[PDB]
Every structure is written in structure tokens, then in C-alpha cells.
Amino acid sequence: TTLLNPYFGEFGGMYVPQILMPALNQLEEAFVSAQKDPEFQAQFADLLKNYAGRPTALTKCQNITAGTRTTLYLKREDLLHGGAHKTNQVLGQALLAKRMGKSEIIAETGAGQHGVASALASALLGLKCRIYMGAKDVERQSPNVFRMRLMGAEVIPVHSGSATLKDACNEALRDWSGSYETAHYMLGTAAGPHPYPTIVREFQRMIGEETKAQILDKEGRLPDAVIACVGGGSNAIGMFADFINDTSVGLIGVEPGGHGIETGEHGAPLKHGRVGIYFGMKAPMMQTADGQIEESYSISAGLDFPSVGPQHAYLNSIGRADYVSITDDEALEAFKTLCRHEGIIPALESSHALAHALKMMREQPEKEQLLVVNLSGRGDKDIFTVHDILKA
Amino acid sequence: TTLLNPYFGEFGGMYVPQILMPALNQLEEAFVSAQKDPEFQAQFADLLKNYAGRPTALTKCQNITAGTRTTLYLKREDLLHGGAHKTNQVLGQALLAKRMGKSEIIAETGAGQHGVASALASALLGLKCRIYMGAKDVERQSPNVFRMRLMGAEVIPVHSGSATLKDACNEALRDWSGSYETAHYMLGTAAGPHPYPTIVREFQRMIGEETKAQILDKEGRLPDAVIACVGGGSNAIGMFADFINDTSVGLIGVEPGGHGIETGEHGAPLKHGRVGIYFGMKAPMMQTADGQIEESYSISAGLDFPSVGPQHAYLNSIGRADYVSITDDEALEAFKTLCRHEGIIPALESSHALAHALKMMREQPEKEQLLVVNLSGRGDKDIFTVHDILKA
Amino acid sequence: MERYENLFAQLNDRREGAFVPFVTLGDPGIEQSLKIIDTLIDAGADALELGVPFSDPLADGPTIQNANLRAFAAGVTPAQCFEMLAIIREKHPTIPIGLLMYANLVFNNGIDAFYARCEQVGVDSVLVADVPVEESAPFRQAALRHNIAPIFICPPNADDDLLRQVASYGRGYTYLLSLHHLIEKLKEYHAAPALQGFGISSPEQVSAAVRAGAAGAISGSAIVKIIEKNLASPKQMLAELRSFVSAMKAASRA
Amino acid sequence: MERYENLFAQLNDRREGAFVPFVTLGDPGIEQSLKIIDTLIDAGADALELGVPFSDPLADGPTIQNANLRAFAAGVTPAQCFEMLAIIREKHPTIPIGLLMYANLVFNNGIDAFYARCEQVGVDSVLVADVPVEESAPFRQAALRHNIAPIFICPPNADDDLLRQVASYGRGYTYLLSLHHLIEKLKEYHAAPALQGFGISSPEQVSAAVRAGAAGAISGSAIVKIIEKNLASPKQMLAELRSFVSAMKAASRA
Ligand SMILES: O=P(O)(O)OCCCc1c[nH]c2ccccc12
Numbered sequence A, B: 001t002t003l004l005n006p007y008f009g010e011f012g013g014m015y016v017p018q019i020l021m022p023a024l025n026q027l028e029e030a031f032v033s034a035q036k037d038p039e040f041q042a043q044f045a046d047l048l049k050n051y052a053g054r055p056t057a058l059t060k061c062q063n064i065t066a067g068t069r070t071t072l073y074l075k076r077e078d079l080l081h082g083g084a085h086k087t088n089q090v091l092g093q094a095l096l097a098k099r100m101g102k103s104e105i106i107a108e109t110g111a112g113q114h115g116v117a118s119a120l121a122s123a124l125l126g127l128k129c130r131i132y133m134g135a136k137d138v139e140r141q142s143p144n145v146f147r148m149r150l151m152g153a154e155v156i157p158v159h160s161g162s163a164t165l166k167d168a169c170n171e172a173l174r175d176w177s178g179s180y181e182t183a184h185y186m187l188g189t190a191a192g193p194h195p196y197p198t199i200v201r202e203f204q205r206m207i208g209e210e211t212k213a214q215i216l217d218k219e220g221r222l223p224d225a226v227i228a229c230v231g232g233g234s235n236a237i238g239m240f241a242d243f244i245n246d247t248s249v250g251l252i253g254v255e256p257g258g259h260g261i262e263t264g265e266h267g268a269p270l271k272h273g274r275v276g277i278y279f280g281m282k283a284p285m286m287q288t289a290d291g292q293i294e295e296s297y298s299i300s301a302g303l304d305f306p307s308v309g310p311q312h313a314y315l316n317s318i319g320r321a322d323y324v325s326i327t328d329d330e331a332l333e334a335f336k337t338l339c340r341h342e343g344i345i346p347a348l349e350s351s352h353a354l355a356h357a358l359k360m361m362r363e364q365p366e367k368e369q370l371l372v373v374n375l376s377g378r379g380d381k382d383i384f385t386v387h388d389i390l391k392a
Numbered sequence C, D: 001m002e003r004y005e006n007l008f009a010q011l012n013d014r015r016e017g018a019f020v021p022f023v024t025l026g027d028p029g030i031e032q033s034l035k036i037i038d039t040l041i042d043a044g045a046d047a048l049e050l051g052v053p054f055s056d057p058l059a060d061g062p063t064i065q066n067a068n069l070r071a072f073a074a075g076v077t078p079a080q081c082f083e084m085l086a087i088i089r090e091k092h093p094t095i096p097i098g099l100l101m102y103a104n105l106v107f108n109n110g111i112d113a114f115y116a117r118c119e120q121v122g123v124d125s126v127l128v129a130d131v132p133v134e135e136s137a138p139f140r141q142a143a144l145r146h147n148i149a150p151i152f153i154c155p156p157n158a159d160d161d162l163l164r165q166v167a168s169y170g171r172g173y174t175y176l177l178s179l180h181h182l183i184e185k186l187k188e189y190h191a192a193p194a195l196q197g198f199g200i201s202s203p204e205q206v207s208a209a210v211r212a213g214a215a216g217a218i219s220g221s222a223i224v225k226i227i228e229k230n231l232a233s234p235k236q237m238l239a240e241l242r243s244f245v246s247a248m249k250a251a252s253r254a
């Protein structure tokens, strides 16, 4: 039994070993309680404002759209403390862990942004943090690994399986199965077993709420579409949530097309995978014809989650949101364009969302449209990657 | 003749070759005009808010001060677009350049933060930007150099002299002497010839104005002291300005002590240099007994300006502000402490200011005091430096 | 078929506990794995619990995680596992055979098709490690339609409602994960006989499980370690597996 | 002393322009620099403009920047420069000697002390490159008290107020940086005789400056380049300096 619906249509659920169910039920109950607690809401709002820097700006990009009938705004999650939207939800989950009397945090991370965010939230809130990271990811993210250690977190390399994000995801679950009494598993995206998709969306929903108030203030109307990259689905569902009931607002999720969908080397399970059951949920997955889970490929390390949040699969199924893909080269071109024309270095993740907005604009330049791209993070971290590619 | 006083007591002035005086007078006149122009003020406020992310948060640091009678807040310039306070004033100077009908920007940079900020402001505002950087600095700041190029700026290595910041400063002036008709020299700190010390302070003064409103809101009184690192003096004078007439508020500037004042390897000309005339002003300088200008040394690349803003020398002389120094090791310890206890990675520049606040707290733990440290920038850029040192 | 029912009836007639080893199919290769399984049976295994290698065995400890990797290194696929299962059943008609599966491999090409394939090759039960009772409906329904026993784990804590669900939903045997109260309650609610599992690695643990009221004990990591330890010597591997299983099974006898 | 006044009177009696080379003291070494200066004089220099190496010559172009670096590489200090200046004056009693200084080197140990040292060694003028008329008061006052001519640059544009200030404030000569209107106005306001400078590198430029009404021409980069070009051959260096100065001075004659 649960207090909230674990499914979005056919997607979602709680596909975890029996031993983990009490942890999920405990978390769901604490969450429902926290959401009705004005004190919890005030403490969360306070950290978001005074520690993380909310609200984040909504920046109009006139130089990029000059000569077309597209008006483009960027929701500036790149200006959030930590440099990405991940910070919002780790602060809420950290407060939930404390609400449950937990003193420890367990987290998984691929590119390391979630590890960094979990570590910073744990440092601020006095939680003892341990992070699982696939050894291949550890190897290629030494900067993020060192930040986690400076912040007091223990980083544990995972060598099992492919030694990447999904393997770290399995190890986090394994750990929690036996330590949930004193540790909270701080899941990094709007995926996994209920109640995580729900919790993560609610702790990222201020992105869309602010965007709505900011766009109404600046344009006196809602956007024609809000566009966000989709790795696991948290920044996108955070931007989409408050607009779901505004039927006129398009919700466009952008998955990584990698070297191109036809190459098979991509990270677009929602539109090009097959529904499966893994990581505690039923959702579209990157998997072999046999049912073995595979990695997502993208020039962007952070769009590496091999599945997608169940609410996105659901919004897609009913036609409420549309999902598309953007290739590595398209994302790189958008990264370059934003740097040169607006002086903003976007994360390569976010660059996928920008790349799709640029296509909407460039393909029909005389189409009048008000677009908001969720700039989920800053791209300082991608400078070396982009440099080498350009050097190549 | 000038519209405004070029001096702060005996310090300041316009010590430039005759050929550059018309450029300084033109700039001063445009500045005075802009400051009275409500439209210029609105355009500047708009970019600061919607593009740069102002106001920045004022974060209370309870974990750092636990057990003492010190209450410490950090003014979060690290959350400003670009990651440091430099962004504020480059946007104002870029708008001034446009007010004067200039289409090009010239800038100098040491550690590269100012180059990056000048490049981003130029990209946003459609100015053609060229940056001078000493070749030794180019060599050790390839990440910042590449960001400047991604943003469309031309980066010009300076091999003359010591091939560092002061040499780039000389080359910027040289260039401008012949191009001021169409180019604006975007000076990077509150130093150099009038009107720059004045302009830079006014375009950074929102730091202190916001801090004052935020601290009054949160504590109902002014701080006992505001503390800021002093490289050239811009972030410090930006924090200090609005408090100058609040006699009860201490203004503490922190210069880099490097390996220790007694070693001579430091960057504390205000308290340990000798007044000289260079870079267009009369001010305390790092110089030989003979009068040759020397480099400032600090573990922090950004506290490399070999002199200090004339207004700081003046505030020091009359006893309105107090200047102290913090060594490399003290700054590193503060960097570590903030990361571990608040989950904020501070710039090593800013870490000097934090290190001094920590000393004020630790030395007299039962002294009741409300302190604000200007966290002038984020420290992602210093992770490698700190790592190697700790590895060493 | 009623292989588990028949087994437990026979064991009860002999006041004997069941000893059930677990191995990963195809670890360290198909041929060696088939020899390992025949050795476990000849050595006295009463039933078998067999894992199909899955890419993300999030309910498995290091030892089994490594067995999955060895099987994958050998190219083992679920299809090959089902080929092995038919060969195993063809050689051993009465031993109960239970699969330890991950949900995706069951759901992949259709839940009903999966249980139909299990029935076709002669498997007797399926324990889907990541399907709690709350999500088990389609799985147990399909299992029951194809005469496959759906196995459920009764966790260490397990409140009363859970014990009642596990007793109602499962068949064949109840997997008792890491005591007397859990066992008495399972019996009270007429649950399938309990097989105790989780770290069983010595004979005294097998005798203690039987003394506690469990119908037997499952041992996997202890078995898999022997494979891991003797990879360079297949003959020694089989000799050590025989010795260990013989000892563990002896401990289950009255 | 009145060396500039005497020089210009003599040159005027001969309807002749002044040719004034500039070199950096101590470039490429003290000994070679003293030989270079004697060669410039023997070759026909009417006066000398001499730079004291400074760490941050922000008013200097690349050629002179490099001369400063060579002098520093040789360990040249302002003190050594003043030692050279006394030796130069001791050998040449009437040639006007002007220093090209940066403000810090003048202000360093006291502005008045600096001009007192200039007077002691026999220097005739000082042009502080980074001191505009607006900040010149202490410098020109100290210069005048020690019988040193303070030299000011009249920039290409220079409005009327500036021409009037330069005419009133300067002595010795007016440095005319990069025309007829500037020259006529300087004469109208009774400014010190104008020496045209900035890129003068050929004889025709010297004759043109004199034709335009200037009292002479200053050439520095063109001279310093000859030093730069012949570093490996000091003898050839001096021969080429002699040839160039002789040509430039010939162009100034009626
Ligand atoms: O001896 P042990 O502790 O390794 O138990 C091995 C039991 C069979 C077994 C292997 N992998 C699993 C995942 C979930 C439940 C049971 C299993």
C-alpha cells in the first residue's frame, strides 16, 4: 500500500527487493508529511533563497534570435549554487533525511554533478555523505571527485558491471537496503522507484513556477513552449510541472542523440528504447534485444542515465509532452553559439535543449514563438571537452 | 581640469602620457553624464538583475561559527554570472563604452577572470573585445584563455617586462593611447588613473548596498565589520562604499601575505610597500629600493595587482579602514574550512577575507561580533592548485 | 508438476532438511557450469536455485556479481541458459529447479511468454529478486497459469501483513532471508515450506535452520566462492564443490 | 646653465635644424652605451635624449621596450645611469643632455632630490613621460629650482589651452609629437623651440621638420634599431650609428 500513486499510467512503480520496501514506504510517508508542514516548506525556501541563490534569473537572448520572430529566454539554473539545477532537490532530500532522523546520506553519480550537489548539501546540513560512482566515471571526473572530498564526502568507486552510472545506481540501492535505518539514499534524478520520481519533481518544481511568474512579468503571457534536456528527467520535469495544466504551453524534452539515432550510439531511450523494468521502475530503457541494460552515449557526460523518469514516458504517451533528440554536433554548435552571442557558457547537457530551440527558430524564422530553454547548468566543466574536440 | 576630484587625499591622480588625457577626460564626462541618466541606470540595473543574477544572496554560516559569539555572513558574489564580482563593473563599463559610441573594448587580465568578464560583457553587448595578458599568465591560465576565445574575444599575450599583469596593464594603456577614439579601455580594478578608481567603485557599490539591506533585514542592524580581500581593490571598495559613512561599521581589507610578510614574497603593498607613481596613479606599490615595479606574490593568482586602489590607501591613512594580510597557508585553511563546513568552494582570493574573519572569531571566541565577508568569487578554478599543494 | 511438494514430502518422511545450492548458469562457462550442476546433484543437492546472468543484479552481493561477470565474459545469454535448463532437466527428472531472475529478463519479451518457456523446459519456480509482493500480481498470475511456483522473499523484519501476503502468494517454498517467529507465523498462515538463506556457509548453519523449523537451507555465495577459487583448476573445483555440498547435505539429515 | 638656449641660438645663426638622437642608457651595456653616445656626438648629434631603464615604460614602443630589457639584462640601475651621465658631461661640456624619465624614478627618493642630482651631474632637461601638464606642478617647480628644463609633449591634437600650458610650462625645447598650426601656435605663445619626434627615421623627415618650422628632430627607435641589429658586432654597430647620424644631421643643414 502507498499514500500516493506510484505510477504515471503504465510507468513507474516500486520494483525493488522486498527488503527495501519499508525504506520506500517510510520515505513516502515522511515526504507527504513534509509537504504539509509549513515549517519544512519555510526551511527549504530559506535554504533555496539564502544559500542556493533562488530565484534564478530568466534571461532574454536577443542576440541569438535577431532577425527571426522567435523570442528566447533562458531559465538560469546555471547561476544556482553548484552550477546546476541539481542543488534544488538535494537540499530538499537532505532536509527530508533530517526530518526522518537520519544522519547519513548515500548518493550515486555519473558525471559527478549529483555527487557534488549531494556532498554540498550534506556538508551544509551536517550529514555524513558517501557517494557511489562507477570507476570509469571516477577516472574521467577527477575534478568533481576532488570537490566531493573537499566537501567531506566519501567517494566509493564501483567496479561492477560497466563501472558507470547504472552500476553506481545498483550499488547505492544495495547499500541502502542494509543501512536505511540511519541513512537516506539521495537519488539524483526523477527516476527510480516511487516515491523518488514524485519527490524529485516536487523539489525541482520551483524552476517552472519561477519561470511562469517571470515570463508573465516580462511578456504578459505564457511561453509557447518550454524546452529542457532529459538525462534522467529532473530538470525537465522541474521546468514542466507548473505548466502541465496550461494546455497551450508546449513541453519539449530533449534526449541526447549522441552520434545519431541511426548509429545506435545515443541516449534517447524514451523515443528510441524499449520499456523494461530496472532501477526500481518500469520505464523506457537502453537495453539489448535480450533485456540486458546498456549505457547511454552522449558527448555530455550528464545525460548518461540509461532510462528516463516514468512521468516523462507518461506525458509522452498521452501527447502532453513531446520528446526529440539532439546530436553531439548540434549540442556543440549550440554551446558555441551561446558563448559567442550571449557570453554564457552552457553545460553541454543544457546545450541539447538550446540546440533544439535554435532548430525551432532556424527552421521557421518567421514563425512567431516565445520559447524558454531551461539552462540546467553552466559549462565551465565542459571547456576541456569542447576544446579537444575543436582541436581534433 | 576635471569634473570630479582625481585624488583621495594624496593618492590617485592621472599620471598618464599627455596623449591619453583626452581619453580620460572624455570617459569622466561620459561617466558623470551616465550617472545622472535614469535610462543608463535602468539598463545597467536590468543587466545586473536579469543577466548577471543580482541581487546575490547573503548566506549565514552557522556551522563555521558554532560555539563562538561570532555571527558570520558571506555576501555571495561567487553566485554572480561569471563566478566573481568582476562581472558587475564590466557590464557598467561596457554600457559606458556604448554610451560614448565606442564599438571596441580593450582589457588587461592577470589570472584571467577580468579577461573572461570583459569578454562576456563584450559578447552580450556587441562589442569587439581584445584582451592583453602577460605571456606567463597566458601559459598558466589556459582555461580562462579558452573561455575568452569561445566568447569571441581576441587574446593578446604580452611578452614585455615580467610578462605578467603589470605588463599587460602597460600594453593596454599603450593600445588605447592610439585607439581611444573607437575603443574603450575596460580597466579591471579600482585603480589606475582617474576616473577609473571612481568608476569601478560606483559600478561595484551594489555589493555593499545589497549587503546593508540584507543584513538589516536579517539582523536588524549593521555589521560590526565587513571584510574583503584586496588585490587591486574593486570588490573591497564595492563592499565598503555604502558603509563608509556608517562610522560604527569596520572596513577591513585583506591583502595577500603570500609566504609571509617577512619573506618579502607577498602582495601587500598598502601596508608593506612604498608610495610610488605607476599605472597612472600615485599609490602604494610593490617596488625595489630603486623604484622599479615588482610583482605581487600570492598563492592566489587574482591578488596579483602590484599596487592598490588609491581610495584604499586614503581610507587607510585617515583610519577609516584597516588593512591586514593573510598568508597562503591561512587562505588555504579557510578554503578547506568553507568547503567542509558550508559546502561552498570559495575563490582563493576570497579565502583571504574569510581567513581573516576566522582569525577574528578564533582569537576572541567570546567576543560578540557580526561579520560579513565578501565572497568575491567561487573556487572551482582553484581546485587543481589546492589539490597539488595538498598532494605535495 | 509438483516437484517441490514431492521433495518436501519425501524429506519430511525422512525427518530431513533440504539443502539447496545456488549457482549462476554459465559460470564460468556453459560446459563447466553443466558439470558443476551435475556435481552439486550427485553430491546431494535436494533442489537447485539457478541465476540467469543479468547486467544489473542490484539484489546481489559481490560474490554473485562476479559470477555474473564471469558468465558474461563467456558470452552467456538467457537463451543459452534455457538451453542448459532443458539439458539439466533431461538428465534429472525430479529435482526441483528454481530460477533467480531479475524483472527485466522476465518482462522483456512478455511475462506470460517467460513463464511459458520455464514450463516448457521443466523449471519449477521463479524468484524475481526485484519484484516485491506489491508489484507481483502479473508475475505470480503468469507463474500459476504455467504451473510455475512464484517464490517470494520473507525479509528479516516482515510485518504481519507481509507474512500473510507471502504465505498466500507464494508456492513451492518461501525464501526466508535471514527467526522462529517468522517461521511459526509462516506455518500458521500455511505458507510454502521455508528455505532459509543469506550467508549459509557451514554445516552447523544447515542443522540450525532445520532445528529452527525451516524446511531447509539455500547456500549460494559459499558455493560460488568455490568456483571463484578454483577457476584455474576445474577438476579441483568439482572436487571441492562435491566435498562442500556433501558436508552441507549431511548436516540436514536426522 | 643655458645649453639649449645656446644651442638653438647657434643653430639659428647657421639656419640649421637640430638633430637629436635618443638612446637608452646602458643599452646594451654601460661600456658599449658610453661608446655609442660618443659616436652619436662625434657623428653630429646636436643634443642627446637619454632614457633611464624603467621596469614599466608604458609610453614606449617595442623598440625602446627591448632596449630597456637589454639594459636591465646588463644590470643597469638609475644610479649607474647617473654615473654615466657625469662621465658623458665631463667629456662633452656644451651638448644639451635631456633625460626621458618615468615618474616613479623621479618621485622615488624625492622629486626635489632627483632634479638636484640632475643638476649635479650636468643634465639639462627632463621629460617625464607619464606626467601630463595637469600633474606637472611639483616636477616643473623642482626642475626650475635646479636649473633643469622641464620638457613637455605637445600631442598631435592638443587643443589651444594645452598649447598655452605647454608653452608656459616647458623650457629648453617643446617635444612635438607627430602640424604647421601646432608649430605656429607654439611660436605665438613663445614656447620653447619645437623638436619634432615620433618615427623620425630618415633624412627627408629631418629636412621636412625644419621646413615646417620646427627647430629640429628627435630620432630614437631608428637609432635603437641599429643597436638591436648589430648586437653581435659592436664595431659594425658604431659604424652604422655614425653613418645614420651623419646622414640625419646633414639633412638639418641649410
Ligand atoms: O548464500 P547467499 O547469501 O549468497 O544466498 C544465495 C541465495 C540465492 C540468491 C542469489 N541471488 C539472489 C538475489 C535475491 C535473493 C536470493 C538470491
Ligand SMILES: O=P(O)(O)OCCCc1c[nH]c2ccccc12
Binding pocket: D022, D049, D051, D059, D060, D064, D100, D129, D153, D197, D198, D199, D200, D218, D219, D220, D221, D222
Ligand atoms: O623615434 P621615436 O619615435 O622612437 O621617438 C623617440 C623619442 C624619445 C623617446 C623615447 N621614449 C619616449 C617616451 C615618451 C616620449 C618620448 C620618448
Ligand SMILES: *Cc1c(COP(=O)(O)O)cnc(C)c1O
Binding pocket: A083, A084, A085, A086, A113, A114, A188, A189, A190, A229, A230, A231, A232, A233, A234, A235, A236, A302, A303, A347, A349, A350, A376, A377, A378
Ligand atoms: C545532471 C544534469 C542534467 C541531467 O539530469 P536530469 O535529471 O535529466 O535533469 C542536466 N543538466 C545538467 C547541467 C546536469 O548536471
Ligand SMILES: *Cc1c(COP(=O)(O)O)cnc(C)c1O
Binding pocket: B083, B084, B085, B086, B113, B114, B188, B189, B190, B229, B230, B231, B232, B233, B234, B235, B236, B302, B303, B347, B349, B350, B376, B377, B378
Ligand atoms: C580579480 C579578483 C579579486 C581581486 O581584485 P579586486 O579588484 O581587488 O577585487 C578578488 N576576488 C576575485 C574572485 C577575483 O576574481
Ligand code: NA
Binding pocket: A230, A231, A232, A267, A268, A269, A296, A303, A304, A305, A306, A307, A308
Ligand atoms: Na536517459
Ligand code: NA
Binding pocket: B230, B231, B232, B267, B268, B269, B296, B303, B304, B305, B306, B307, B308
Ligand atoms: Na595589490
